[PDB]
Amino acid sequence: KSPEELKGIFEKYAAKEGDPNQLSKEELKLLLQTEFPSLLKGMSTLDELFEELDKNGDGEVSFEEFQVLVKKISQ
């Protein structure tokens, strides 16, 4: 899906507990088990991608890397 929609869902989870502009790890887990839980058939690609996004040295998915990820998902 286009990043414009991603923000709308992203901020809903982000503005819950941790950083209002970044997806806390535990909130990621909630978003994950909502849209793409079993649909990815347990492929590590979801985890390997997110785990490379927090390679800034953080426990929350930063807004930019989240949006740029879905930019490259079309490639």
Query: What token pair was written down for 34?
Result: 């909502």
Residue 35 is labelled as binding a ligand: no
CA within 13 Å, CB half, 14: 17
> How many DSSP H helices and E strands does the chain contain?
4, 2
User: Rounded to the nearest 10 degrees, what angle do helices 63-72 and 45-53 cross at?
Assistant: 140
| Contact by Cβ (8 Å): 63, 13 | no
| Contact by Cβ (8 Å): 32, 44 | no
Query: What token pair was written down for 58?
Result: 């953080």
Residue 19 is labelled as binding a ligand: no
Residue 58 is labelled as binding a ligand: yes
| Contact by Cβ (8 Å): 3, 72 | no
**Which residue, among 2, 61, 65, has the nearest Cα to 28 in the 3D structure?**
61
Kindly list the domain boundaries of the chain, sorted by start residue.
Answer: 1-75
1-75: CATH topology: Recoverin; domain 1 (1.10.238)
3-state secondary structure of 41: coil
Cβ count within 10 A of residue 26: 13
Indicate the DSSP class of residue 36: S
Residue 27 is labelled as binding a ligand: yes
Q: Report how far apart, in Å, the C-alpha atoms of 18 and of each of 3, 12, 57 are.
A: 21, 11, 16
